[model samples]
Target: PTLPEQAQPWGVPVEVESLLVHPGDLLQLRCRLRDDVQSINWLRDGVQLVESNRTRITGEEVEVRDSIPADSGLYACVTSSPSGSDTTYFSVNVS
Candidate 1:
């Protein structure tokens, strides 16, 4: 689906890092955006993710503890404001 024209890709682009981690390792993604943006959202494989003991969101940080192979995939950080919304993506790998 096409995002509303009011939304756009803004802020710093996500740099894909060659991150390798074990199933028990803790992983975190830092999603940075302009101060003007209203809210920040995190998604895994296009499905919105919520905070839990396993996955926690603090400010711009998305932390996943005791990671597993199922956690490996495309992740996106989306920002929204009254003006518009924007999205950026990164990939994660778990061993």
Candidate 2:
């Protein structure tokens, strides 16, 4: 017997990446801008994140001090400009 072949979607880009870290370690994520942007923000698990005692966000970089198991989640960098907007994602695993 022969099996049917499945067709994949076209023009879709795979951009999700993975990161592994241990507890009590510093985890830092950085996003570089290619063109000028009006604003930039960071999100964790699809929710916007603000600076706290353990989390710090700079211009284009975010650092988590003493990362814990709870810090393991999806982190995305979103940017908006006059032309358009874009997003980048990261899957972080802490153990």
Candidate 3:
């Protein structure tokens, strides 16, 4: 499907951002998207994270979650449909 013509990727274009935190501190990731994709997924350092619903990683203008040290690395946001796919990347680390 055509993405309503106005669907340009926006927000946090660079795959990396900085966060200052302690070991037990909670970090959250918010990947903003503009579509309801079928195969929306998140990957770390090119590997997929395994949680029951970790694969359904898309939302209306944003998808967010709490982070841990394990969450630190190259991250990517991907979505797919009969039309095609779009992806975004990020890297998270501890303070």
Per-residue lDDT tens digits of candidate 3, residues 1-95?
A: 33522333343555533444345455444443345555656665576543432222434122234454555565565555678766666555654
Segments in model 1 whose C-alpha atoms lie over 4 Å from true places: 1-18
Candidate 1 lDDT over 1-95, as tens digits, reads 23322323333455333355688888776665565565778776456664677778654657888677646776676766789776666466688
lDDT of 1: 0.62
TM-score of each: 0.69, 0.69, 0.54
What would the TM-score be for candidate 3 when compared with the true structure?
0.54
Q: For residues 1-95, what per-residue lDDT tens digits would candidate 2 score against the true structure?
A: 21111111111232344577788887766654545654657677566664667778764656887777646786676655788765666565687
Clashes of 2: 0
Question: Which is the leading candidate under TM-score?
Answer: 2
